[PDB]
């Protein structure tokens, strides 16, 4: 029984197929803000 932790989430799309791609790379990501210390965040809003 194995286990592993993906430490960061930076980041973004990787349209390379999933047996090739790195960890930290999601398959889609909308309105995300992969910062340095904090990982995924919402992008800060608009003001009118």
């Amino acid at each position: 029984l194995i286990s592993q932790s993906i430490k960061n989430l930076k980041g973004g799309i990787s349209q390379q197929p999933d047996i090739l791609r790195y960890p930290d790379q999601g398959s889609r990501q909308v309105n995300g803000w992969s910062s340095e210390t904090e990982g995924l965040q919402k992008r800060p809003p608009l003001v009118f």
């Binding site: 029984l1 194995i2 286990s3 592993q4």
Partner: protein, 49 residues
């Protein structure tokens, strides 16, 4: 003076994610901190990698 030389052992009992050791003092007196250790039982069930 009362100064002394290390080490000093003191119980930090509990989980690692919850214990926050910190050193306030005050004072009219110096300090030096060279290193810090810890021991403790480690048991990861899911033998990783």
């Amino acid at each position: 003076l009362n100064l002394g030389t290390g080490q000093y052992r003191f119980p930090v009992v509990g989980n690692a994610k919850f214990n926050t050791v910190y050193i306030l003092s005050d004072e009219t007196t110096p300090l030096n901190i060279i290193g810090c250790g810890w021991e403790g039982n480690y048991l990861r069930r899911s033998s990783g990698i």
